[PDB]
């Protein structure tokens, strides 16, 4: 069952083993139960840690209900996949990914004062192809000022660094003007909407670009796995797959009392049930009660 804090995340999500648990919880509440006390505790590190480890339990089955658009004609199945992942991030408690990684940027370098360590401490979160170019243009403005560039904003060296890194950003191909005018806003709602109708266009191009990069990586990895697999004779393939399946089955059956092991074994029995149900009536598929 659930422990009164996992069930507060599973309300808006639509994955099956969360929806059936929420439905059994409401079956408990309608049939004469009181709601347990929500904890007014757990100081901020434990709060964001349990957010990190509780949104994981609602995102990780959400990826498996999302089918990859591997090798399809048109960029619109990539838009389907990225929209599904956006909806999964929305139902997982994450924000828009732009403002989410902006929040991570602010969280990472709250204690950085110069601009070289703001490019050092956010090395894991930005592209190294872009981090190398930003470090080299910062070494250029460092050769200009002959002083460490300060990460304050009102410094003239940082102003020249901003006017050079905007050219670096257009050199990467992404327009910094529509993005800065989006997050800086305008007076009237009409010239804010005219900026948003460019920023959302770039935003769609950006998320479909990295989603298409992801499905191209899975396409090439599946092609490499198949081409390393087709070079084997069939008895070696059957022995390797049966031995790997038996070993990872022994790894589950060894864990006695573990909940994940019991769920693993029940899903194995459900897979065998699916094989039996397609074996009984293969004209229509599995037997589903309706």
């Amino acid at each position: 069952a659930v422990s009164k804090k996992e069930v507060l995340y599973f309300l808006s999500s639509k994955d099956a083993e969360s929806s059936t648990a929420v439905k059994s919880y409401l079956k408990s509440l309608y049939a004469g139960a009181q709601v347990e006390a929500t904890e007014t505790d757990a100081s901020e590190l434990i709060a964001q840690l349990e957010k990190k480890y509780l949104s994981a339990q609602v995102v990780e089955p959400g990826v498996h209900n999302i089918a990859l658009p591997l090798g399809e004609s048109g960029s619109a199945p990539v838009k389907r996949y990225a929209a599904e992942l956006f909806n999964l991030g929305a139902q997982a408690g994450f924000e828009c990914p732009f403002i989410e990684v902006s929040k991570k940027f602010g969280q990472e370098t709250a204690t950085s004062e110069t601009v070289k360590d703001v490019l050092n401490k956010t090395k894991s979160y930005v592209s190294a192809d872009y981090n190398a170019a930003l470090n080299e243009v910062l070494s250029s403005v460092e050769a200009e000022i002959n002083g460490p560039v300060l990460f304050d904003g009102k410094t003239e060296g940082f102003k020249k660094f901003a006017a050079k890194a905007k050219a670096v950003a257009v050199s990467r191909g992404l327009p910094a003007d529509t993005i800065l005018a989006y997050c800086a806003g305008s007076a009237n709602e009409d010239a804010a909407d005219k900026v948003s109708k460019e920023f959302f266009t770039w935003f769609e191009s950006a998320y479909t670009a990295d989603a298409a990069a992801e499905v191209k990586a899975i396409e090439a990895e599946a092609a490499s796995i198949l081409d390393r697999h087709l070079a084997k004779p069939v008895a070696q393939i059957r022995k390797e797959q049966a031995s790997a399946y038996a070993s990872l089955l022994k790894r589950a059956e060894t864990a006695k009392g573990a909940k994940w092991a019991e769920k693993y074994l029940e899903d194995v029995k459900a897979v065998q049930w699916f094989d039996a149900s397609v074996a009984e009536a293969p004209a229509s598929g599995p037997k589903v009660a309706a």
């Binding site: 090798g71 992942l85 994450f94 990684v101 930005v126 930003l134 304050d152 992404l174 993005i179 004779p233």
Partner: protein, 176 residues
């Protein structure tokens, strides 16, 4: 889908588009009788004007029924399509059973015949291993968990290089 929809018996489709099934409706004042004719089947119903808005009160919410996962089914679909692409070029192999007669055996250099019979055994090996379709269910499970860990990011599942680059421009070019 939203809970309130706004469609039905207004800008509705008026007729058929295929030769497999026929349909024509009755656009009367208050009511509507459909007449759908499909070969050996015949159906003519009488529906009301508000009988189409009560249709979308309950939602269907169609869902997949997958053996392992919908993601695993998509990866197994791509492995089946790649096995189709390899099977299309094991289908253009030249027929070598026509050169098994003994009038090709004894006119041949012996090592060339050794090479030819070993090439035939190699083709039978390649064809037995490209049509092992039971093994795609365990080939797909080696692509799954690294992908599922990549989508289990600490910032956002749909995150990528370009959106992080754009937000780094937004973080850097503003006043700290």
């Amino acid at each position: 889908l939203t809970t309130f929809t706004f469609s039905g018996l207004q800008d509705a489709p008026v007729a058929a588009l295929s030769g497999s099934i026929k349909l024509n409706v009755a656009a009367k004042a208050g009511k509507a009788e459909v007449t759908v004719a499909a070969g050996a089947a015949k159906a003519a119903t009488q529906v009301s004007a508000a009988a189409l808005r009560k249709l979308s009160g309950s939602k269907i919410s169609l869902a997949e029924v997958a053996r392992i996962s919908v993601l695993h089914s998509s990866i197994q679909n791509y492995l089946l399509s790649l096995s189709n692409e390899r099977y299309q070029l094991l289908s253009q192999w030249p027929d070598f059973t026509t050169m098994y007669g003994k009038d090709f055996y004894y006119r041949a250099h012996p090592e060339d015949l050794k090479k030819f019979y070993d090439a035939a055994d190699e083709y039978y090996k390649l064809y037995e291993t490209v049509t092992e379709f039971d093994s795609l269910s365990a080939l797909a499970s080696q692509v799954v968990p690294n992908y599922a860990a990549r989508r289990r990011s600490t910032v956002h599942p749909a995150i990528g290089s370009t959106v992080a680059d754009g937000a780094f421009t937004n973080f850097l070019l503003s006043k700290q």
